[PDB]
Design a protein around this ligand. Structure first.
Ligand SMILES: [Mg+2]
Ligand SMILES: [Mg+2]
Ligand SMILES: [Mg+2]
Ligand SMILES: [Mg+2]
Ligand SMILES: [Mg+2]
Ligand SMILES: [Mg+2]
Ligand SMILES: [Mg+2]
Ligand SMILES: [Mg+2]
Ligand SMILES: [Mg+2]
Ligand SMILES: [Mg+2]
Ligand SMILES: [Mg+2]
Ligand SMILES: [Mg+2]
Ligand SMILES: [Mg+2]
Ligand SMILES: [Mg+2]
Ligand SMILES: [Mg+2]
Ligand SMILES: [Mg+2]
Ligand SMILES: [Mg+2]
Lengths: 143, 108, 64, 228
RNA sequence: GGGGAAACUCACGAGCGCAAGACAGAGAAGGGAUUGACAGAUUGAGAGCUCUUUCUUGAUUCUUUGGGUGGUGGUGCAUGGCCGUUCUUAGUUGGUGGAGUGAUUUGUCUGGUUAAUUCCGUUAACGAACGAGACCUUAACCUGCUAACUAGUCUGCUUGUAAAUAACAGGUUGUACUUCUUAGAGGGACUAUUGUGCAAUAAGCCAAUGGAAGUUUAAGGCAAUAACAGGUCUGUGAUGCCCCUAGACGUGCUCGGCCGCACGCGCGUUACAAUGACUGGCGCAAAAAGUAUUUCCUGUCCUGGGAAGGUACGGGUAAUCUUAUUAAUACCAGUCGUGUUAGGGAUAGUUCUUUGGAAUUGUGGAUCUUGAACGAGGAAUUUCUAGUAAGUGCAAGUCAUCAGCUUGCGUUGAUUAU
C-alpha cells in the first residue's frame, strides 16, 4: 500500500469543519481546490494568512497543503481553515521533523493566538419555549 | 455443496441496552464459529422522534411544554456464511423491543 | 456555588477515617482508591468525594 | 415481507398497539390484579405475557376468560390461531405491585370499610412485603359534598429526581360511588435489589448511597530462609 | 382551549330528513305490521320530504303505557384525572430528650458560608424523613480503543483540460486506514495547580496558570409540606346531580355565522432608509420530515414570459433517494443620490395559475398598473448578561388549500454589567 508521507489535521468553529492534508514539496495552499485568494469574504483572508506570516514563509515553501472545508457559514469556515492549517504544520513537524520544532512552533503560534491549536467550545443554544430565542421571552403585561 | 452467502442483519430497537445485548452476542457467537467472517456492528445515526406537547388540557394561562422523545437505534452486522451457521448464530433469547431483519446475497 | 454537601463530606470523613494510611495528596490516586474501596453510583459523585478527601488530607498534613 | 413501513412510523405504530392492549387488558381484566403486559413479536406469532397477581382469574373456569380474550384479540386485529399466543405470568410479590394494591383498596372501599383502616391494611401489607415505604392518596368527596384530599404515608419515600422513575411505582384508579367518582393513587417505593437473582425492586442503587468498606485481617504465612 | 373555522369542524343562525325511540306490559298484525320507489306536481336539492299514483316488500315490527340509548346541553362551588400559580423561591415534618398547666416551643440558631435550612460552626438538644443536592437528557474534549459500501480517507490503476510523476477535477481499487463522519466501551473535572490574596486560616470566596471544559462546565427534565372553593363536564366509553327526549338539546343534509364595524384594549408582522433600496455575480448551514404503491418527500427531462403544467426517464419507508444539497444575513461589482426619492410599500383594478364538488365575503401564487400612513414615536412600559442580545433565513406542528402563530434549527454576531 506504500504508506504516504501524509499528515491530516482537522479544525473547527461552530458547525464548520476543515480537513487539511500536508505533504512535502513546493508550497501550495488550496482550500476546497482553489487558492486562498478566492475565499469568499475578502477581509478575513488575512486571518488565514496569519499563521503563515507568523511562522514565516520558510516553513511553508517546503510543503504542499490542501484544505477541504465544509461547514456552517463563511466566517466560522475561515476559522476552521485557520485551525486545521496551524495544527497541521505542528503534526508534520511531529512525525517527520524533531519534536523540538513541534514544540517551538506550538509556543510560537499560541503566544500569538490560541484559537489556532484549540477549538472554540461555543456552539448554538437551543430555544426555550415561550420566546423568539434561546433566552428572551414573550412580552408580559403586568398592571 | 458449498454455499458462500453474505448475510445482512439489521437490528432496530427503541431500547439501547437490548440492542447492544443482541449485537454483541451475535458478534460473539459468529466469531466463535470458524466458517464465519464478521463485518462488525455498524452503528447508524440515532433516530430521535420528538413530540412537543402543551401540558394543560386547557388554555390555563401559563404555556408549558413536554419534550417527548423516542430514540430508535439501528445496527447492522454482516456475515460470510452458509444457511445452517446463520441459524446457529440467531439461536439466542432477545429482549422484546428488538426488530431483526435478515437478507441474503449469494456470492461466488 | 462550589459549596460541598452532606453526602460528600460524610463520605470524605469515612474514606479518610478507615483509609488514611493508603491515601495520597494526589486526587487521581485517591479517586481510584475510593473506587476500589467503596460503592459510588456516580463518576461525578466519586470525583467530588475524592477531591474533598484530598483537600482534607492536605488539611490534616497541617494539623488537627 | 408484508409492507415496507417507516421505521419511525412502524415503531410508533408498535407502541400504539402496545398501549391499546394495555387499555384493553386493564379494562376487561379488572377483577384479578393486573399489572403489566409484555409483547414479543415473531414473523410467525405474537406472544403476550400478561403479568398479573391472580393468574387464576385470567384463565377463568377452564379458559372461559382466556378463550374469550384470545378470540377478542383475534376478531379485533384479525389473526390466525397460530399467530396469537397468550400467557399469564404470576407476579411473585403482590406487595411490590401498585396497580394490584390500588385494586385492593378499590375493593375494600366498595364494601364501605372505612378509609384509614383500609389504607393502613394495604400499607402494612406493602411494607410487610419488603417495600421501603409507601403512600396512598384518596381524593374527592369523602366526608361531605365538599371535596377532600387525604394522604397516608409510612416508610421511606422519594418524589423528585430520576430515581423517582426507578424506585417509585404508581397506579391510580377511579372508584365509583352513588355520590360520584372518588379516586385513589398508590405510590410504592420499591426496595433496592443488587442481584439479578430475583424479580424484585430496583437493580441500580439510589445515587445517594455511599458506603466505605473497612479492611480485614486474614491468614498469613511467610516464606523465610531457615536458620541452622 | 394546539382556537391557522370557506364545506366538515360546530356548539350559533334560517329551512328541511332520519331513528341508530333499545327493553318490558297492553292492543294491532301473516287474509299484513312495516321498507322501498318510478312519474307529475313539489323542493334550494334525482330529500319518496310532502301530494296524486300504485307496485313492491314479508316481521327487520306500528299504536298507545312505561322506560333506555344519545346529548359540544347546565353545574369546576357536586367530582375524579390532568394542568396552571404561589415557586425552581427554600422550604416542610416526625421520634427520643429539654421548656411551658396549656395552645405551643426547642430541634428549625447569633455568626460566617452557599444558587440552596448548602455546609461550617454555635448549640438543650440528639439523631432522622421529604424538598435542594444526588440523579437523568442534550452540547463541548479523545490523531488512544471497538468498527463501518447505508460514512469518509488514502494507495495503485486509469479519464479530461495541460509539456506534463505540475494543477484541478471525475471513474475505479484494497486480506488498506479512522483525522474528518457515524456511535458504542472507557477515559476526562475534582474548582486541579500555585498563591505570607480575602477569609478570626472553617466552610468558602478571589486571582493567575494549565485545561476541551471551571458561572452548580452550558442548556434543560424532574419538582416536598401546604394551599388558591385558580382552569378544565367542550379531551376522555372518568363520572354525581340537573336538564333535552321525535317538527328532540339525538344523529344528518343545504345555505349562512364565527373574518360582520363608530370604537376601547393585547400578542405581533412590516417600515419610516446611505450601516440603505435595487440590478447582476458568488459551489457558506443546521435541524427536522417523507409513499396501506402513482396518493408521501421528490431528483432528472420537456413545455410556458410567469405562477405553473406535462408525463418523458427515475430513486427513496430511507445515513442508501429528495441531499449530505437549495437558506438568508454577509461579500464583490454596477445603478440610484438625501427629496414622500426606487425609502415604505398599505389600498385598489384587469389579466394568468394552483388546492379544493365548492374559492365570490379577494385560500394561496404570477404580470402590469396603483401607490397611503410612517421623517424614529406622549404618559407609560416589556425582555434580556455570551454564541447571549439583535438581525437572518430554514424546518416541524397545524394542513386538501391557508403562517403575520407556535415549537424548534442553524448563520452573522454585539453594547453593558459579573
Ligand atoms: Mg425570526
Ligand atoms: Mg375565533
Ligand atoms: Mg346519560
Ligand atoms: Mg348536536
Ligand atoms: Mg416533639
Ligand atoms: Mg416532648
Ligand atoms: Mg410537661
Ligand atoms: Mg421556625
Ligand atoms: Mg442536623
Ligand atoms: Mg442543573
Ligand atoms: Mg371561580
Ligand atoms: Mg412536477
Ligand atoms: Mg426537503
Ligand atoms: Mg375577485
Ligand atoms: Mg393578499
Ligand atoms: Mg406541507
Ligand atoms: Mg395557534
Amino acid at each position: 500500500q506504500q504508506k504516504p508521507q501524509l499528515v491530516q489535521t482537522f479544525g473547527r468553529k461552530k458547525n464548520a469543519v476543515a480537513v487539511a492534508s500536508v505533504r512535502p514539496g513546493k508550497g501550495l495552499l488550496k482550500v476546497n481546490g482553489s487558492p486562498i485568494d478566492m475565499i469568499n469574504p475578502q477581509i478575513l483572508q488575512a486571518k488565514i494568512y496569519e499563521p503563515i506570516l507568523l511562522l514565516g514563509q520558510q516553513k511553508f515553501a517546503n510543503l504542499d497543503i490542501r484544505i477541504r472545508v465544509r461547514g456552517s457559514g463563511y466566517t466560522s469556515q475561515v476559522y476552521a481553515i485557520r485551525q486545521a492549517l496551524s495544527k497541521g504544520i505542528v503534526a508534520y513537524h511531529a512525525k517527520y521533523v524533531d519534536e523540538n520544532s513541534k514544540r517551538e512552533i506550538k509556543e510560537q503560534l499560541m503566544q500569538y493566538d490560541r484559537s489556532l491549536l484549540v477549538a472554540d467550545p461555543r456552539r448554538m443554544e437551543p430555544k426555550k419555549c415561550g420566546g423568539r430565542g434561546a433566552r428572551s421571552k414573550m412580552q408580559k403585561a403586568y398592571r | 455443496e458449498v454455499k458462500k452467502v453474505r448475510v445482512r442483519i439489521t437490528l432496530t430497537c427503541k431500547n439501547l441496552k437490548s440492542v447492544e445485548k443482541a449485537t454483541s452476542e451475535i458478534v460473539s457467537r459468529a466469531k466463535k464459529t470458524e466458517q464465519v467472517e464478521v463485518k462488525g456492528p455498524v452503528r447508524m445515526p440515532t433516530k430521535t422522534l420528538v413530540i412537543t406537547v402543551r401540558k394543560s388540557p386547557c388554555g390555563e394561562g401559563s404555556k408549558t411544554w413536554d419534550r417527548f422523545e423516542m430514540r430508535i437505534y439501528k445496527r447492522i452486522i454482516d456475515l460470510t456464511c452458509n444457511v445452517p451457521d446463520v441459524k446457529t448464530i440467531t439461536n439466542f433469547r432477545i429482549d422484546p423491543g428488538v426488530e431483526i431483519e435478515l437478507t441474503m446475497t449469494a456470492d461466488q | 456555588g462550589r459549596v460541598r454537601t452532606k453526602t460528600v463530606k460524610r463520605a470524605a470523613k469515612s474514606l479518610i477515617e478507615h483509609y488514611y494510611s493508603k491515601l495520597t495528596n494526589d486526587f487521581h490516586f485517591n479517586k481510584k482508591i475510593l473506587s476500589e474501596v467503596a460503592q459510588v453510583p456516580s463518576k461525578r459523585l466519586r470525583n467530588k468525594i475524592a477531591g474533598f478527601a484530598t483537600h482534607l488530607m492536605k488539611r490534616i498534613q497541617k494539623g488537627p | 415481507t408484508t409492507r415496507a413501513i417507516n421505521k419511525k412510523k412502524k415503531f410508533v405504530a408498535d407502541g400504539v398497539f402496545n398501549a391499546e392492549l394495555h387499555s384493553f387488558f386493564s379494562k376487561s381484566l379488572q377483577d384479578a390484579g393486573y399489572a403489566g403486559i409484555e409483547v414479543r413479536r415473531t414473523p410467525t406469532k405474537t406472544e403476550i405475557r400478561i403479568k398479573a397477581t391472580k393468574p387464576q382469574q385470567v384463565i377463568g373456569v377452564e379458559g372461559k376468560k382466556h378463550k374469550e380474550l384470545t378470540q377478542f384479540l383475534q376478531k379485533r386485529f384479525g389473526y390466525s390461531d397460530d399467530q396469537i399466543q397468550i400467557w399469564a405470568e404470576p407476579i411473585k410479590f403482590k406487595g411490590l405491585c401498585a396497580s394490584a394494591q390500588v385494586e385492593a383498596m378499590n375493593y375494600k372501599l366498595l364494601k364501605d370499610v372505612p378509609v384509614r383502616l383500609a389504607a393502613n391494611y394495604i400499607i402494612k401489607s406493602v411494607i410487610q412485603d419488603g417495600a421501603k415505604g409507601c403512600e396512598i392518596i384518596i381524593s374527592g368527596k369523602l366526608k361531605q359534598q365538599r371535596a377532600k384530599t387525604m394522604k397516608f404515608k409510612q416508610g421511606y419515600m422519594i418524589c423528585t429526581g430520576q430515581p423517582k422513575n426507578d424506585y417509585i411505582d404508581v397506579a391510580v384508579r377511579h372508584v365509583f360511588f352513588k355520590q360520584g367518582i372518588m379516586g385513589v393513587k398508590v405510590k410504592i417505593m420499591l426496595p433496592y435489589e443488587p442481584n439479578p437473582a430475583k424479580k424484585f425492586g430496583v437493580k441500580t442503587p439510589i445515587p445517594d448511597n455511599v458506603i466505605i468498606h473497612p479492611p480485614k485481617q486474614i491468614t498469613d504465612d511467610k516464606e523465610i530462609r531457615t536458620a541452622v
